[PDB]
Amino acid sequence: ETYRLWKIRKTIMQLCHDRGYLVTQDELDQTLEEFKAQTDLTVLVAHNQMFVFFPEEPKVGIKTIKVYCQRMQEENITRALIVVQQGSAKQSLVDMAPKYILEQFLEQELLINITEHELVPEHVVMTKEEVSELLARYKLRENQLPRIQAGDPVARYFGIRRGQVVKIIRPSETAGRYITYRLVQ
Amino acid sequence: RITTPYMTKYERARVLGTRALQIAMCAPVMPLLIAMKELKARKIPIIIRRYLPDGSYEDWGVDELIIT
Amino acid sequence: RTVITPDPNLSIDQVGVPRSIAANMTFAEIVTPFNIDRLQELVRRGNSQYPGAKYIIRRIDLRFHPKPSDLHLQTGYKVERHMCDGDIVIFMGHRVRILPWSTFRLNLEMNLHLPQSLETRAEIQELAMVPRMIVQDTLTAVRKFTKRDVFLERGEVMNLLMFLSTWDGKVPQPAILKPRPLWTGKQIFSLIIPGHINCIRTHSTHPDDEDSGPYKHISPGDTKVVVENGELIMGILCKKSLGTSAGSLVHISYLEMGHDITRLFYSNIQTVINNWLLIEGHTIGIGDSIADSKTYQDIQNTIKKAKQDVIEVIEKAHNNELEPTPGNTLRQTFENQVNRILNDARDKTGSSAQKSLSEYNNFKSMVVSGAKGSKINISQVIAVVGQQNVEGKRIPFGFKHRTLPHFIKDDYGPESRGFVENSYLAGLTPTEFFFHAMGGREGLIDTAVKTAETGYIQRRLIKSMESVMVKYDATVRNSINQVVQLRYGEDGLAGESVEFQNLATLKPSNKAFEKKFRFDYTNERALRRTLQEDLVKDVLSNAHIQNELEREFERMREDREVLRVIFPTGDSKVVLPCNLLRMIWNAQKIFHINPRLPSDLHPIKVVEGVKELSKKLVIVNGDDPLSRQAQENATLLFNIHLRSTLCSRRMAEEFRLSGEAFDWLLGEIESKFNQAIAHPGEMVGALAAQSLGEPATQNVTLGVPRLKELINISKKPKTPSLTVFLLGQSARDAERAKDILCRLEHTTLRKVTANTAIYYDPNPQSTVVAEDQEWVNVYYEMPDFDVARISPWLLRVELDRKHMTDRKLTMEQIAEKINAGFGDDLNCIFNDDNAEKLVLRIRIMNKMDDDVFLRCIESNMLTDMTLQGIEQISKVYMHLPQTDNKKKIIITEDGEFKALQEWILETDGVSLMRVLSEKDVDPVRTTSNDIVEIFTVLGIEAVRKALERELYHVISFDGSYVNYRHLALLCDTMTCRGHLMAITGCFDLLLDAEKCKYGM
Amino acid sequence: YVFAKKDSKYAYTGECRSCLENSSRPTSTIWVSMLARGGQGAKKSAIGQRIVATLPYIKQEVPIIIVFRALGFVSDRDILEHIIYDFEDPEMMEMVKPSLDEAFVIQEQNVALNFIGSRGAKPGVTKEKRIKYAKEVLQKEMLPHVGVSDFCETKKAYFLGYMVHRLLLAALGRRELDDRDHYGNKRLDLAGPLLAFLFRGMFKNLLKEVRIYAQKFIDRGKDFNLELAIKTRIISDGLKYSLATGNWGDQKKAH
């Protein structure tokens, strides 16, 4: 079973490494044998801040949801993951959303990392200082790009809201590094 | 000045398709074989209007441009 | 509207319209000072004669009552003459020549449309003339014209020079001169080839062993086409080097000389071999379709053993003496065993028939010459027709186990299911005439179906890309003015001005790369011999010279590595615009260079010449930091090749160019690269819809029922699959991977059940079986959970021996999962596989009386258990791969590529996430073919990349080819909006008045 | 015909298309069909596969043993003595066993015939309608060719029971099932039988206007005359229309 807490934790820490947040080297590289100590599992770091859950309920109820909002708002954390192990209650995550954003992952959807797979080129989320040039050199607009949708599992991976623009550097076989810019919806 | 410094093959269909049309309709010569000589000697009174997809344009003349 | 009839005496862009049809059509001419003295004759004649006119738009109906008061004609008027020669009509755009009968002759029904203006005429002329967008009779006879044997005496040259067009009046000097001065047919065929053109191809008879030490450039069959300097030195031609294929001599003469120089290269060979053949003829007697008796008796000595070795496998399998190969039953492995012994004798009678045909045999002149392919369709003339099939199977039993009323039952033999001993020359048995009437019916319908399949994809996929264009940003934009691609085809380059080239830094090893490209400047005898005496001190002295040439090689090591990232496959065939080994092979001819002398080129001029060139090739404009990285990625793949084949060592050693050569060479690339930049104005939608529906006409379902399914993206694949690779040491063993194999199959308990019954044994000490009373007591000597009342029934299920050790199943994990599946209120008792009978006893702890409810428990465990594996996952195969594409590609410590085998898994049924998650399933190389299932896991960028992996796979299975730029537009109009969906003149002109003031 | 079907709510269905002598009553395509074993709950799955009988003019799936008890039978030896021939083979006797369990509460022929008639064209209200209606269903419009009289109850009991015996012989895999293409199952028709199909539908129309012309003359009762009453242009147009154009039938319902 310890795959499903080691490989999971090795996914989250590579997740929040490439979400931009401060992630150290060796704790990415913990083998399962070196993991033979350890809910009792929570990753808590900040940006270059983030909380990580594992609810002991396999199915999260709303009675669980109002518990940690006491420690959400007091401990001044905003972004937080909930690894809901099986799966109405999503409307609770709409309620607290415009202040502090949270989101929901299935357990076995996360057992392996999809960014490492070869048919997924390495996306990069762009900043508003960089968007404001790409809208100007090509003389593009706010729309009028290849759109990407909200519930996309790489949009869900990086935590992209509606309105950002990611770049895509794919290794292609006529030039080598064709670069494409996905608008998010 | 971000348009291509050559003549695309669609301009040359519409330059020579119309320049031979006016020479057929009693214009000063500077019908189809007439305008082929004028382009390949670069004497044509036409300025190409190339838009851009933003809405803008760029006005090019033939002597500013490299013909095929 | 009338027939088309063939006519090889028209220059290709011509049509023969007869005078009963051109005397109804009109081309409304507007009067100039030119024609005002010409058209008055054509007004004077009227509608009586042929060269006349109908209307005069002054609108006078000049066909009856001519009224000579109104025969005025001043400039500005519009006259509607009938027709003449030289005019242009539409299909492409032909040109009217008049040939008087009732048929439309054209050099290979149709209507005829005629445009009505001098603007839309010239749109057809400079875009869509017939050359701007080779018959059997010519293409065979080119083989016979171009051997060593053929000599033309003196008078026949004076005819085959009369039928050229591009000829300059001067007769060549012949080869032989002791008799009459005989001209070889290769000398005259050198006169057609238009100017300096270079090529090397191999005729379709050339053995691969002929490239040994001796007889390399001689090749005593006179194969190996070598056209140096536009003059045919050696070699026979064929289809392979005169069609339109890669590296073709007609292909090369479109990338050097234009198109109106190549249309003359057709209409010369469409005459001088079409009109030499009146001296050869090329008949087909029936003597050209008879085997000599040396092989004709031996061709039966195969088939008399074929029908023996089918009897050998029927009587072997009718005695239970044939082990079933795993994957299929004894039935399906019987058929695969016998269709093996009827496609080897179909081919051992197929290679010995082609080789046995004589050198004069006229079938061999239409196969070796390659003009008519399908060399299997004349192996049925001579030797053996072969097997018949319907539905992919040899003939099913129609009547009742008897395919015809002439046979016995139990006839699986080699003739009572379809195979044909006889060939069409010897005639066919009256049974086998019926069976070939059945194989000709299954293929006679599919033709009537595959005209309502690929006649519908191509007229639907056009309405997908109806107006996707290239705007003047050279982005890719369409009707709803959205950006599809930022640069057209990932580098901006255009479609029909690229070739196949090789890199030669990717493919070789690590030691060879420091031997082939290193340029050791120190050994002093190389550069003595490979370079001039004036520079032999110049290289050795200055350290500033010697420290640039490392920085050439410094980039090439860091150019080597990026090729081993973009191309992990070790496949070095690259599509790239200007061929940097023809244009070096050219420059050793224009400038008359002797390569056996020391060169005279300065090596810094090589390095500086490349670097100053690579800035002059502008795909993306601008001096921004945005467009700077956005440029050098569009020309990374080409700028690495551009240093590999223009190195400081490769110029001076393999190529021997001179100082006046390299000045011409680098400046010609820039003049030839700048044409392959795409012209903004291209209707790319028609160019890329008509390059995917054309190879639509030519057990994973491949071809049209797969290609139809990706056009609408069906949610339910008729054959989904999931190819699965492996990670560790399990990849190299079949016994380690059997644990991986059994964890994917949906194994219920129906698969392992021997039989099932219900007894009523309320006392376990007195069961109806006395044999189990040993171990039933063992669970009841120290009994557990017999607490209040066991229900007095007994469900007794027996298990198996094969299917229970095939998956290493445990009696515990069956009993534990039922106990975990239904709670402790189902008293399940496992027993031992140590004895030869495996028993599982299932009792019940305390409406729906217990005899019925024990069945419903039993009727759930037959259907819904999931003992192991994942649901909706059928038969899970396993094999080591045979093809060199799906193998594992590990770079060794000498940088060499190496293919390494490993056990792969090809399943049925798709559930991607649980499959990826389990132990030693590869995170990286695992991929499915179900687009819908791959879009809900990996994103949208494993649809855009992996709808390519399917459209390339429904095309390259036929061996065919599609340029990649026509796949990156079907993959990029479906996935534009983030989710997959189904299907179902920008510029202007201004008048320049400042130029218009002067000019008479 | 014991065919097989792919997706539908059955497994190994049968079929017969009875008619006698190319007389009237063109067809009555009675099925007999075995349900699947993909049943949910203890309706079928805890008992096994059942057999039904899609009789004509009944928009339902009237099960088997109900039909035999409408034939004047009572006991379950004298219903299985028309289905299975050897009573000493357990492999067939298992198969019919879960179909007696569904048709179990009805015993008297006054009740099964109420059960059958209660599903008809227009369902009658009294029981005396549903005694009347399904009495002529099961002897006039179900297997006419085995008998059309009012005493063929003993006969029809076999050839209906014969189909169930050929339903089981393919459900067990103990007999090959019929190919659909095979031309032993194909009857051709020529100008003889086709005009017989076109002359029946037009000899009744000759009678139909004689039914109309006479009943519009019962009020007088003066006489009756047929030689003015036979409309000769009924036959001499429809045999000339439908044999000219090809729309093989009358000209009033063309699709």
Q: What is the molecular shape of chain A?
A: globular
Q: What is the beta-strand fraction of chain B?
A: 15-25%
Task: Report the strand count of chain B.
Answer: 2
Order of helices and strands of chain B: HHEE
| CATH architecture identity of the largest domain in chain A | 3-Layer(aba) Sandwich
SS summary, helix count of chain B: 2
Biggest sheet of chain A, open or closed, and with what strands and sense? 4 strands, mixed
Q: Roughly how many Å is the radius of gyration of chain B?
A: 13 Å
Distance between the termini of chain A: 37 Å
Q: Total strand count of chain A, please?
A: 8
Q: What number of domains of chain A?
A: 2
Rg over CA atoms of chain A = 18 Å
**Spatial sequence of strands, sheet with the most strands of chain B:** 1-2
- Side by side, the strands of the main sheet of chain A go 1-2-3-4
Outline the biggest β-sheet of chain B.
Answer: 2 strands, antiparallel
**The CATH superfamily title of the largest domain in chain A:** RNA polymerase, Rpb5, N-terminal domain
**Secondary-structure element order of chain A, as H and E?**
HEEHEHEEHEHEE
**Quaternary organisation of the protein chains:** part of a larger assembly
CATH topology of the largest domain in chain A: Dna-directed Rna Polymerases I, Ii, And Iii 27 Kd Polypeptide, Chain: A, domain 1
Give structural notes:
The structure is cut from a larger assembly and holds chains A (185 residues), B (68 residues), C (1000 residues) and D (255 residues). Chain A has five helices and eight strands, in the order αββαβαββαβαββ. Chain A has 185 residues and is an alpha/beta fold. Chain A folds into two domains: 1-112, 3-Layer(aba) Sandwich (Dna-directed Rna Polymerases I, Ii, And Iii 27 Kd Polypeptide, Chain: A, domain 1), CATH 3.40.1340.10; 113-185, Eukaryotic RPB6 RNA polymerase subunit. In chain A, α3 links the parallel β3 and β4. The N and C termini of chain A lie far apart (37 Å). Chain C has 1000 residues and is an alpha+beta fold. Chain C has a four-stranded antiparallel β-sheet with strand order 3-6-4-5, covered by helices on one side. A four-stranded antiparallel β-sheet of chain C has the order 20-21-23-22, covered by helices on one side. Chain C has a three-stranded antiparallel β-sheet with strand order 11-12-13. In chain C, a hairpin with a 5-residue loop joins β15 (476-477) and β16 (483-485). In chain C, α9 packs antiparallel against α12, α20 (549-566) crosses α24 (637-644) and α22 runs parallel beside α26 (659-676). The longest helix of chain C is centred in the middle third of the chain and has 18 residues, at 432-449. Chain D is mainly alpha-helical and 255 residues long. Chain D has a single domain (1-186), classed as RNA polymerase Rpb2, domain 2 (Dna-directed Rna Polymerase Ii 140kd Polypeptide, Chain: B, domain 3, Alpha-Beta Complex), CATH 3.90.1110.10. Helices cover 36% and strands 3% of the residues of chain D. A three-stranded antiparallel β-sheet of chain D has the order 1-2-3, with helices on one face. The two termini of chain D are 29 Å apart. At the A-C interface, α4, β6 and β8 of A face β16, α20, α23 and α34 of C. Chain A: Keywords: Acetylation, DNA-directed RNA polymerase, Host-virus interaction, Isopeptide bond, Nucleus, Transcription, Ubl conjugation.
